[PDB]
Structure formats: structure tokens, C-alpha cells
From Swiss-Prot:
Keyword Repeat belongs to the record: no
Biological process (GO), any one: autophagosome assembly
Gene expressing this chain: Rab23
Residues where Mg(2+) binds: 16, 34, 57
Source organism of the structure: Mus musculus
Regulation: Regulated by guanine nucleotide exchange factors (GEFs) which promote the exchange of bound GDP for free GTP. Regulated by GTPase activating proteins (GAPs) which increase the GTP hydrolysis activity. Inhibited by GDP dissociation inhibitors (GDIs).
Transmembrane segments: none
First-level EC class: hydrolase
Tissue expression from the record: Detected in brain neurons (at protein level). Forebrain and midbrain.
GO cellular component terms, semicolon-separated: autophagosome; cytoplasm; endosome membrane; phagocytic vesicle; phagocytic vesicle membrane; plasma membrane
Name this polypeptide is given: Ras-related protein Rab-23
Domains (record comment): Switch 1, switch 2 and the interswitch regions are characteristic of Rab GTPases and mediate the interactions with Rab downstream effectors. The switch regions undergo conformational changes upon nucleotide binding which drives interaction with specific sets of effector proteins, with most effectors only binding to GTP-bound Rab.
UniProt note: phenotype after gene disruption: Complete embryonic lethality, due to defects in neural tube closure. Mice suffer from exencephaly and severe malformations of the spinal cord and the dorsal root ganglia. In addition, mice display poorly developed eyes and polydactyly.
Disease: Defects in Rab23 are the cause of the open brain phenotype. Mice suffer from exencephaly and severe malformations of the spinal cord and the dorsal root ganglia, leading to complete embryonic lethality. In addition, mice display poorly developed eyes and polydactyly.
């Protein structure tokens, strides 16, 4: 069981960091993270199935309005990411959802609030984040890529939803 997954959202929310954390077990201090290939990979056991997850990176092209059709094509699951400290990233989420739906239709999707380790400087109230999850009817995670909190859980959930 091989699965292509996309991770989308505004720039600097921590998308590349999330993929690096899940597939390599690392977190670096750089202001911007880079992946040198189309996707990183992790092989896991899910309900007696050997599953191979392939997580595709946007290559920073969201800041230049230039994400290609090839990025989205074939996707079987999706992570929508916004940042705790970035008001604009939260407001953009429903539009990112439409971009994916337009390309591949309905696929298992999770909503993610990253950088929860910086909660004292939060630009989004809990009720606001929950209100969005309810409206889009999506599983919602409070995540810290930095502290490795609720990263692995997201991809496991999505893998299980693909199989059932
Ligand atoms: N404090 C904190 N910083 C993070 C977290 N995740 C990513 N970052 C940082 O946010 C910046 C942007 O990360 P990046 O992966 O390049 O975001 P992307 O543009 O969405 O791919 C980098 O400096 C990361 O180290 C987190 O959970 N907490
Ligand atoms: Mg990136």
C-alpha cells in the first residue's frame, strides 16, 4: 500500500520542517528549510498492511504564486497547515482546501495548527480554530514540529483513513 500525501498552507508555517521531522527525525534551526527532492518517505505498519508514505514538498513556491499541477496530481491524502503566530495563514486555510479539491477531489484531510510551543503570542483563539474544524468537518491537531508533538499521529490517522 503506497500513498502520496501533500502538505499545503502559507509560507513559513513549518510544512518542510514537518516532512523532515516525520521522515528523518530531525529539526534544524534554519529560518527556511529545504528538501532536495520531490518527496521524503517513511515505511510503517498499519493494521497488518505494510504502508509506504510519500510526503511531497512545495519547494517554497507558495511565496511566488507558482505551485505546479504536478505537485498535486495523484494525492490520496492532505494536511492543511497554519501557524499559531501568523493570522494570515489561518485565514487562508479554506482556499488551500479548494486548490486541492479542484485537483484531486475529495481525499482524507487533517487540519493542523503548528508552532503551538509559541502559544503566549498566539494570533488565533481556540474557539476560532475549533470553529474552522467544525465547518470544514476535519480532524484537528495542535502541533509542535519543534518539540515533535502531534506530527506522527497526523500521518498515521490519514493512512488508516485511506485503507478504511
Ligand atoms: N517555534 C517553532 N518554529 C517552527 C516550528 N516548525 C517550523 N518552525 C520554523 O519556522 C520556520 C519556517 O519553517 P519551514 O519548514 O521552512 O516552513 P514552510 O515554508 O511552510 O515550509 C523555520 O525557521 C522553522 O524552523 C515549530 O513547531 N515551532
Ligand atoms: Mg517549505
Amino acid at each position: 500500500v503506497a500513498i502520496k500525501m501533500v502538505v499545503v498552507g502559507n509560507g513559513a508555517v513549518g510544512k518542510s520542517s514537518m516532512i523532515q521531522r516525520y521522515c528523518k527525525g530531525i529539526f534544524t534551526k534554519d529560518y527556511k528549510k529545504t528538501i532536495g527532492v520531490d518527496f521524503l518517505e517513511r515505511q510503517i505498519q498499519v493494521n497488518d498492511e505494510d504502508v509506504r508514505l510519500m510526503l511531497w514538498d512545495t519547494a517554497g513556491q507558495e511565496e511566488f504564486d507558482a505551485i505546479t499541477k504536478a505537485y498535486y496530481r495523484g494525492a490520496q491524502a492532505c494536511v492543511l497547515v497554519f501557524s499559531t503566530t501568523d493570522r494570515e495563514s489561518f485565514e487562508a486555510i479554506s482556499s488551500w482546501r479548494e486548490k486541492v479539491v479542484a485537483e484531486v477531489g475529495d481525499i482524507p484531510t487533517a487540519l493542523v495548527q503548528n508552532k503551538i510551543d509559541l502559544l503566549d503570542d498566539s494570533c488565533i483563539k481556540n474557539e476560532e480554530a475549533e470553529g474552522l474544524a467544525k465547518r470544514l468537518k476535519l480532524r484537528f491537531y495542535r502541533t509542535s514540529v519543534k518539540e515533535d508533538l502531534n506530527v506522527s499521529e497526523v500521518f498515521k490517522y490519514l493512512a488508516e483513513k485511506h485503507l478504511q
